[PDB]
Amino acid sequence: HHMRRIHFVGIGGAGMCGIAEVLLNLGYEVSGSDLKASAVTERLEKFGAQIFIGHQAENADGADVLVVSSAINRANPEVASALERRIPVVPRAEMLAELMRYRHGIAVAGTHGKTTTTSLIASVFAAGGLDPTFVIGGRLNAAGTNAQLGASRYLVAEADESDASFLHLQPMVAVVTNIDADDFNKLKKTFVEFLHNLPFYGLAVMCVDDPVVREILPQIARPTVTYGLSEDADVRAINIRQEGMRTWFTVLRPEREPLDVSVNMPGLHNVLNSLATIVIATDEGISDEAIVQGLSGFQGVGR
Amino acid sequence: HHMRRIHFVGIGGAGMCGIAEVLLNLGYEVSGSDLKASAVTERLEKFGAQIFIGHQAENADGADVLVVSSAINRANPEVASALERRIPVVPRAEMLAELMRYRHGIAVAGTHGKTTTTSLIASVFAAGGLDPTFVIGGRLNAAGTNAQLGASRYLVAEADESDASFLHLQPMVAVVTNIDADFNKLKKTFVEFLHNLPFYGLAVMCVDDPVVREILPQIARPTVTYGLSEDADVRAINIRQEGMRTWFTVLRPEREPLDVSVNMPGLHNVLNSLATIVIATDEGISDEAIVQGLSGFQGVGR
Numbered sequence A: 001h002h003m004r005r006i007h008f009v010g011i012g013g014a015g016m017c018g019i020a021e022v023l024l025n026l027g028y029e030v031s032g033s034d035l036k037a038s039a040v041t042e043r044l045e046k047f048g049a050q051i052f053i054g055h056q057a058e059n060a061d062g063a064d065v066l067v068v069s070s071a072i073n074r075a076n077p078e079v080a081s082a083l084e085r086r087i088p089v090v091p092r093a094e095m096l097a098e099l100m101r102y103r104h105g106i107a108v109a110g111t112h113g114k115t116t117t118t119s120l121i122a123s124v125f126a127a128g129g130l131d132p133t134f135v136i137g138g139r140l141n142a143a144g145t146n147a148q149l150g151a152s153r154y155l156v157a158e159a160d161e162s163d164a165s166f167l168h169l170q171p172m173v174a175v176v177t178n179i180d181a182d183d184f185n186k187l188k189k190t191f192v193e194f195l196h197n198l199p200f201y202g203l204a205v206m207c208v209d210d211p212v213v214r215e216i217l218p219q220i221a222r223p224t225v226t227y228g229l230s231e232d233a234d235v236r237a238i239n240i241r242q243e244g245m246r247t248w249f250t251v252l253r254p255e256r257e258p259l260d261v262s263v264n265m266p267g268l269h270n271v272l273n274s275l276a277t278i279v280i281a282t283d284e285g286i287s288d289e290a291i292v293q294g295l296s297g298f299q300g301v302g303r
Numbered sequence B: 001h002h003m004r005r006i007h008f009v010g011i012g013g014a015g016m017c018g019i020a021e022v023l024l025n026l027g028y029e030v031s032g033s034d035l036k037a038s039a040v041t042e043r044l045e046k047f048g049a050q051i052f053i054g055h056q057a058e059n060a061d062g063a064d065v066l067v068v069s070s071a072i073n074r075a076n077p078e079v080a081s082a083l084e085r086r087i088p089v090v091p092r093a094e095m096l097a098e099l100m101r102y103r104h105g106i107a108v109a110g111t112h113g114k115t116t117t118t119s120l121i122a123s124v125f126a127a128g129g130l131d132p133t134f135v136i137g138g139r140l141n142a143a144g145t146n147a148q149l150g151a152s153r154y155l156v157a158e159a160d161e162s163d164a165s166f167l168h169l170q171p172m173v174a175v176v177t178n179i180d181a182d183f184n185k186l187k188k189t190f191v192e193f194l195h196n197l198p199f200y201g202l203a204v205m206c207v208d209d210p211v212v213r214e215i216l217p218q219i220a221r222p223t224v225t226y227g228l229s230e231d232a233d234v235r236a237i238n239i240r241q242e243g244m245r246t247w248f249t250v251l252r253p254e255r256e257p258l259d260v261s262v263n264m265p266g267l268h269n270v271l272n273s274l275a276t277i278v279i280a281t282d283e284g285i286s287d288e289a290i291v292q293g294l295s296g297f298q299g300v301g302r
């Protein structure tokens, strides 16, 4: 193990403080510098972080890896010391992606629906007592009764194809909701390469109502479950009854009896977000009752 | 776990049976078809494989993944049935690369020296009692004479920059021996390969090679450099080239200088041996096992 101590440059900053908390919960030694002590830094040192105030070269001493907010700025004395000694320096987006190596990672990709689907997954998993850490907008959150970031077995994260870290995710389950052309063939290849980062025992969850996902499906040499309203979708919504703030539908699933559910958000697109979620919940062994509870009690993204 | 049963079309092949053997050792259900039974299929059956003689669609029933030799032949009934059901069908090279995921994988890349370096690493790891499975030229081997492949935690494999799986390998340790001539794109491919290491992995880099030296600062992974270069972390000095045999002393961080020998001439074989020494040292292998493994190696394929 060539990573024992991880040093964050600007550990009090957004996205940085959650990553540090996860790494502390994975058992690593974590240190960090910041220009000002705050409630964020005082909470980090109660979790075991060594906090330095201000930037000076000595703050990097002993670190095996440095994490920086984005750009690598050799004008910063901690970064300059690390670079002079060939200590790796990585942006926070890459360390965030690296967390999936330690957890059962569920990556939610596609043009539209990533945030809502990530949130619905977290809600249904919490209703089943699985309490994942989930990542929306680069920020780590804890679902359910478990308050410790990264303590859960599960890590659910939006996967944005424009991020440099997109193709370095190592998920166990990957969803593609849709692929929207607003080079298109480079883009399709990017999504195909993303899905091939799954292990052979992993799962690709594919919306076949989307034309481009349907087009790339035969290229995916990984186990797949398809979903949609389409007559050939593995996991299919029928009997859709739109009723105000809430939509009722029946979900057909391989080797299961039909299940009547509802989602407390309007629009066909939220039936599709719920179907992705049901595929993932079903794969994880979550009960019908918890699926119903998590979809119908969902209070919205951010609530 | 969405892969319980792996089915090999043509499992009696020399390059298929070893992959099947490892998957059996990993606890998977394995089945395979071939045109005729053989000592190979019987060995696999004794390890737990279900063997079908003849090709028919039904041989693939229950499989989660099919493995074929290379090309996907939609005329084969087992392949056609799998494709109709969205069962993945993958060439053996891609299943071979995937084994690194289950093991402590050591990937040996670079334009020159991959086969010899992989072989020396296997020899030293065997001398250290670690019983490695290793891959050269697409062939799985193990040091143990009468052994099932994949028994040990260690998997050492050549990584060819021209293979479709090169950028999907998931090693714990990766060597780049040299990068020798678009060329700007080749550099990028080796840099991307090295970033497939976890942050707690290790990149072993020959700084005598000008292009490896050039890309070294781009590698945001822990690194150990080697070579004859004065600034190499792990350095060969005191080199005496005596017939087909070379003696040299290796300097390592935090260790006393160690005199070794290799019975293959040429400075490139000093470099192949240095890469091996870096990897063996990192793994905690003793001086005695390094000395024995290097000196006893008779040559690739011997």
Ligand SMILES: Cn1nc(Nc2nc(N[C@@H](COC(=O)N3CCO[C@H](CN)C3)c3ccccc3)nc3[nH]ncc23)cc1C(C)(C)C
Pocket: A111, A112, A113, A114, A116, A176, A177, A178, A179, A180, A181, A182, A207, A210, A267, A268, A269, A270, A272, A273, A276
């Ligand atoms: C929060 N939210 N959540 C969504 N969720 C999903 N939406 C879609 N589809 C979109 C239609 O999308 C396109 O019209 N596109 C995209 C493809 O490219 C096309 C140009 N070539 C253009 C959709 C919109 C409305 C009703 C039904 C389906 N499919 C999905 N599958 N699983 C989840 C899911 C969608 C949204 C919005 C749009 C409200 C932000």
Ligand SMILES: Cn1nc(Nc2nc(N[C@@H](COC(=O)N3CCO[C@H](CN)C3)c3ccccc3)nc3[nH]ncc23)cc1C(C)(C)C
Pocket: B112, B113, B114, B116, B117, B177, B178, B180, B181, B206, B209, B267, B268, B269, B271, B272, B275
């Ligand atoms: C079995 N084997 N094992 C090797 N191992 C290594 N070789 C090298 N460097 C090569 C660079 O060789 C070139 O670039 N050449 C040589 C051929 O003709 C090229 C025209 N383009 C120019 C080298 C060759 C000779 C002396 C010193 C260094 N560096 C290494 N680092 N760690 C291991 C290692 C090399 C070999 C070969 C196949 C060459 C015999």
Ligand SMILES: [Cl-]
Pocket: A014, A015, A016, A017, A018, A019, A138, A139, A140
């Ligand atoms: Cl955060």
